[PDB]
Amino acid sequence: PDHTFTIYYYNEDLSTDTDMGKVDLWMWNAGLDGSYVFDGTYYDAENKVTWFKQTITVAGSNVGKTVGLKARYDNTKGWDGGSDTADRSFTISGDENEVLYYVDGSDPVHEKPVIV
């Protein structure tokens, strides 16, 4: 059976009010391909910041595989709209409520980071 995880993304230079629908993830490997668009938000009451959110479904047999990805800032301009500063990656843990925290500028991680 399929596995769904949530991935949060933060970029201080972007806004979850105006840029919603234009910010996505370009992803590859583990069955993933192409664009994956954020369509929700998560308010981080601890850091008092707001994240982009989306859920992503992979095949069950892809749990444990490494995903390559990078954020893109304005997909109405393709790559020319800008992307993250480098290739990122993480491993699909297959946890019950798997959540990835992707701060622009680093690999996404399973534990919630500190933002100021």
Side-chain angles (χ1 to χ4, degrees), residues 4-34:
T4 294
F5 60 92
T6 302
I7 171 159
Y8 301 147
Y9 171 72
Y10 176 83
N11 188 326
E12 53 175 353
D13 294 331
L14 297 179
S15 159
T16 64
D17 206 346
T18 168
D19 302 285
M20 189 66 55
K22 312 190 181 191
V23 187
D24 64 31
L25 303 176
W26 193 263
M27 313 180 78
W28 63 97
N29 301 134
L32 300 172
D33 194 48

Coordinates of all heavy atoms in Angstrom, one line a residue, residues 4-34:
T4 N 2.2 8.1 2.2 CA 2.1 9.5 2.1 C 2.8 10.2 3.2 O 2.7 9.9 4.4 CB 0.6 10.0 2.1 OG1 -0.1 9.5 1.0 CG2 0.5 11.5 2.1
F5 N 3.7 11.2 2.8 CA 4.3 12.0 3.8 C 4.0 13.5 3.6 O 3.6 13.9 2.5 CB 5.8 11.8 3.8 CG 6.5 12.1 2.5 CD1 7.0 13.4 2.2 CD2 6.6 11.1 1.5 CE1 7.7 13.6 1.0 CE2 7.3 11.4 0.3 CZ 7.8 12.6 0.1
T6 N 4.2 14.3 4.6 CA 4.0 15.8 4.5 C 5.4 16.4 4.4 O 6.3 16.0 5.1 CB 3.2 16.3 5.7 OG1 2.0 15.7 5.8 CG2 3.0 17.8 5.6
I7 N 5.5 17.5 3.6 CA 6.7 18.2 3.6 C 6.5 19.7 3.7 O 5.7 20.3 2.9 CB 7.6 17.9 2.3 CG1 8.8 18.9 2.2 CG2 6.8 18.0 1.1 CD1 9.9 18.3 1.4
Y8 N 7.1 20.3 4.7 CA 7.0 21.8 5.0 C 8.2 22.5 4.4 O 9.3 21.9 4.4 CB 6.9 22.1 6.5 CG 5.8 21.5 7.2 CD1 5.9 21.1 8.6 CD2 4.5 21.3 6.7 CE1 4.9 20.5 9.3 CE2 3.5 20.7 7.4 CZ 3.7 20.3 8.7 OH 2.6 19.8 9.4
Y9 N 8.0 23.7 3.8 CA 9.1 24.4 3.3 C 9.1 25.9 3.8 O 8.0 26.6 3.8 CB 9.0 24.4 1.8 CG 10.0 25.4 1.1 CD1 11.4 25.1 1.1 CD2 9.5 26.5 0.4 CE1 12.2 26.0 0.4 CE2 10.4 27.4 -0.2 CZ 11.7 27.1 -0.2 OH 12.6 28.0 -0.8
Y10 N 10.2 26.4 4.2 CA 10.3 27.8 4.6 C 11.4 28.5 3.8 O 12.5 28.0 3.6 CB 10.6 27.8 6.1 CG 10.8 29.2 6.6 CD1 9.7 30.0 6.9 CD2 12.1 29.8 6.7 CE1 9.9 31.3 7.4 CE2 12.3 31.1 7.2 CZ 11.2 31.9 7.5 OH 11.4 33.2 7.9
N11 N 11.0 29.7 3.4 CA 11.9 30.7 2.8 C 11.5 32.1 3.2 O 10.4 32.5 2.9 CB 11.8 30.5 1.3 CG 12.9 31.4 0.6 OD1 13.2 32.4 1.0 ND2 13.4 30.8 -0.5
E12 N 12.3 32.8 3.9 CA 12.0 34.1 4.4 C 11.8 35.1 3.3 O 11.1 36.1 3.5 CB 13.2 34.6 5.4 CG 14.5 34.5 4.7 CD 15.6 35.1 5.6 OE1 15.3 35.7 6.7 OE2 16.8 35.0 5.3
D13 N 12.3 34.8 2.1 CA 12.2 35.6 1.0 C 10.9 35.3 0.2 O 10.7 35.9 -0.9 CB 13.4 35.5 0.1 CG 14.7 36.1 0.7 OD1 14.6 37.0 1.6 OD2 15.8 35.6 0.4
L14 N 10.1 34.4 0.7 CA 8.9 34.1 0.0 C 7.7 34.3 1.0 O 7.9 34.4 2.2 CB 8.8 32.7 -0.5 CG 9.9 32.3 -1.6 CD1 9.7 30.9 -2.0 CD2 9.7 33.2 -2.8
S15 N 6.5 34.4 0.4 CA 5.3 34.6 1.2 C 4.2 33.6 0.9 O 3.9 33.4 -0.2 CB 4.8 36.1 1.0 OG 3.4 36.2 1.4
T16 N 3.6 33.0 2.0 CA 2.6 32.0 1.8 C 1.3 32.7 1.5 O 0.3 32.0 1.2 CB 2.5 31.1 3.0 OG1 2.0 31.9 4.1 CG2 3.8 30.5 3.4
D17 N 1.2 34.0 1.5 CA 0.0 34.7 1.0 C 0.0 34.9 -0.5 O -0.9 34.6 -1.2 CB -0.1 36.1 1.8 CG -1.6 36.5 1.8 OD1 -2.4 36.0 1.1 OD2 -1.8 37.5 2.6
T18 N 1.1 35.5 -1.0 CA 1.2 35.9 -2.4 C 1.7 34.8 -3.3 O 1.2 34.6 -4.4 CB 2.0 37.2 -2.6 OG1 2.3 37.3 -4.0 CG2 3.3 37.1 -1.9
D19 N 2.7 34.0 -2.9 CA 3.4 33.1 -3.8 C 2.8 31.7 -3.8 O 3.3 30.8 -4.4 CB 4.9 33.0 -3.3 CG 5.6 34.3 -3.3 OD1 5.9 34.8 -4.5 OD2 5.9 34.9 -2.2
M20 N 1.6 31.6 -3.2 CA 0.9 30.3 -3.2 C 0.5 29.9 -4.5 O -0.3 30.6 -5.2 CB -0.2 30.3 -2.2 CG -0.9 28.9 -1.9 SD 0.3 27.8 -1.1 CE 0.7 28.8 0.4
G21 N 1.0 28.7 -5.0 CA 0.6 28.3 -6.4 C 1.8 28.4 -7.3 O 1.9 27.8 -8.4
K22 N 2.8 29.2 -6.9 CA 4.0 29.5 -7.7 C 5.2 28.7 -7.1 O 6.1 28.4 -7.9 CB 4.2 31.0 -7.8 CG 3.0 31.7 -8.2 CD 3.3 33.2 -8.6 CE 2.0 33.9 -8.9 NZ 2.2 35.3 -9.5
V23 N 5.2 28.5 -5.8 CA 6.3 27.7 -5.2 C 6.1 26.2 -5.3 O 5.0 25.7 -5.0 CB 6.4 28.1 -3.7 CG1 7.7 27.5 -3.1 CG2 6.4 29.6 -3.5
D24 N 7.1 25.5 -5.9 CA 7.0 24.1 -5.9 C 8.3 23.4 -5.5 O 9.3 24.0 -5.1 CB 6.5 23.6 -7.3 CG 7.5 23.9 -8.4 OD1 8.7 24.0 -8.2 OD2 7.0 24.1 -9.6
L25 N 8.3 22.1 -5.7 CA 9.5 21.3 -5.5 C 9.7 20.5 -6.8 O 8.8 19.9 -7.3 CB 9.4 20.3 -4.3 CG 9.0 20.7 -2.9 CD1 8.9 19.5 -2.0 CD2 10.1 21.7 -2.4
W26 N 11.0 20.6 -7.3 CA 11.4 19.7 -8.4 C 12.0 18.5 -7.8 O 13.0 18.5 -7.1 CB 12.4 20.4 -9.3 CG 12.6 19.7 -10.6 CD1 13.6 18.8 -10.9 CD2 11.7 19.8 -11.7 NE1 13.4 18.4 -12.2 CE2 12.3 18.9 -12.7 CE3 10.6 20.5 -12.1 CZ2 11.7 18.7 -14.0 CZ3 10.0 20.3 -13.3 CH2 10.6 19.4 -14.3
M27 N 11.4 17.3 -8.0 CA 11.8 16.1 -7.3 C 12.2 15.0 -8.3 O 11.6 14.9 -9.4 CB 10.7 15.6 -6.3 CG 10.2 16.7 -5.5 SD 9.0 16.2 -4.3 CE 10.0 15.4 -3.1
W28 N 13.1 14.1 -7.9 CA 13.5 12.9 -8.7 C 13.9 11.7 -7.8 O 14.1 11.9 -6.6 CB 14.6 13.3 -9.7 CG 15.9 13.7 -9.0 CD1 17.0 12.9 -8.8 CD2 16.2 15.0 -8.5 NE1 17.9 13.7 -8.2 CE2 17.5 14.9 -8.0 CE3 15.6 16.3 -8.5 CZ2 18.2 16.0 -7.4 CZ3 16.2 17.3 -7.9 CH2 17.5 17.2 -7.4
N29 N 13.9 10.6 -8.5 CA 14.1 9.3 -7.8 C 13.0 8.9 -6.9 O 12.1 9.7 -6.6 CB 15.4 9.3 -7.0 CG 16.6 9.5 -7.8 OD1 17.5 10.3 -7.4 ND2 16.7 8.9 -9.0
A30 N 13.0 7.6 -6.5 CA 12.0 7.0 -5.6 C 10.6 7.1 -6.3 O 9.6 7.2 -5.6 CB 12.0 7.6 -4.2
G31 N 10.5 7.0 -7.6 CA 9.3 7.1 -8.3 C 8.8 8.5 -8.6 O 7.9 8.7 -9.4
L32 N 9.4 9.5 -7.9 CA 9.0 10.9 -8.1 C 9.6 11.5 -9.4 O 10.7 11.1 -9.8 CB 9.5 11.7 -6.9 CG 8.9 11.2 -5.6 CD1 9.6 12.0 -4.4 CD2 7.4 11.4 -5.5
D33 N 8.9 12.4 -10.0 CA 9.3 13.1 -11.2 C 8.6 14.4 -11.4 O 7.4 14.5 -11.3 CB 9.1 12.2 -12.4 CG 9.9 12.7 -13.6 OD1 11.1 13.0 -13.4 OD2 9.3 12.9 -14.7
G34 N 9.4 15.5 -11.6 CA 8.9 16.8 -12.0 C 8.4 17.6 -10.9 O 9.0 17.6 -9.7

